[PDB]
């Protein structure tokens with residue numbers, strides 16, 4: 001299947017790093033953050049990637065080009081207005097086609113094996129969930145067997161990893177413009193159409209300098 005990497009975020013919490021460098025292109029261990037995803041995706045057998053962008057977008061295209069150096073074919077979905085995650089995915093659907101695709105929040109650094117998702121999967125969406133960051137119980141969702149439901153307090157909830165397989169039909173109808181992805185996932189969940197899994201390996205949402213350091217720390221433990 002195809003993959004989409006979300007890369008339209010402005011990274012305001014990463015400043016001043018993101019003043020002249022798009023977040024996707026910030027180096028983590030001598031390598032641009034998004035290039036971990038491109039290499040992982042190519043290793044996992046993915047050959048076609050869609051990347052949306054907004055903030056400093058043309059720098060992303062300039063740097064990655066057509067993706068041939070990664071053994072990929074990349075298409076870009078430029079966004080001129082703030083579309084958010086859901087609206088942005090929707091805007092890119094023409095490039096993705098009608099088949100389920102792998103969706104990867106580009107801000108993430110992880111050792112999750114993307115090739116696990118090319119196995120028989122369940123529903124309109126299949127979500128990779130991880131331990132709640134910061135040692136809290138808030139999270140987003142709960143996982144019962146393979147079935148994902150909406151979170152409830154802090155007894156045993158999990159956090160959405162930003163790694164998933166989505167069915168384009170998830171966006172069936174859908175307000176053409178700017179909207180959120182989570183709300184759509186809960187309608188699917190409400191209909192028993194969302195499966196999931198709990199990944200217990202390394203995962204960092206790289207949204208701050210502190211998260212960047214943590215990712216570097218873990219990446220340095222893997223090299224050894």
Ligand SMILES: O=c1ccn([C@@H]2O[C@H](COP(=O)(O)NP(=O)(O)OP(=O)(O)O)[C@@H](O)[C@H]2O)c(=O)[nH]1
Nearest residue numbers: 006007008009010011012013084085106107207
């Ligand atoms: O409108 C958007 C916003 C976010 N995103 C995607 O989700 C990622 C960031 O998610 P984010 O919600 O934290 N936005 P951000 O401005 O980066 O917060 P901050 O770092 O504090 O400035 C971005 O890199 C994209 O991958 C989009 O694709 N579109």
Ligand SMILES: CC(=O)N[C@H]1[C@@H](OP(=O)(O)O)O[C@H](CO)[C@@H](O)[C@@H]1O[C@H](C)C(=O)O
Nearest residue numbers: 085105107140159160161162163181182205
């Ligand atoms: C689409 C997506 O990846 N959402 C996740 C991403 O959002 P981000 O923090 O990058 O803005 O990382 C968070 C954990 O750090 C999750 O809670 C987000 O999922 C929540 C439920 C959401 O859909 O808004």
Ligand SMILES: [Mg+2]
Nearest residue numbers: 008009010011
């Ligand atoms: Mg942003």
Ligand SMILES: [Mg+2]
Nearest residue numbers: 107205206207
């Ligand atoms: Mg982030």
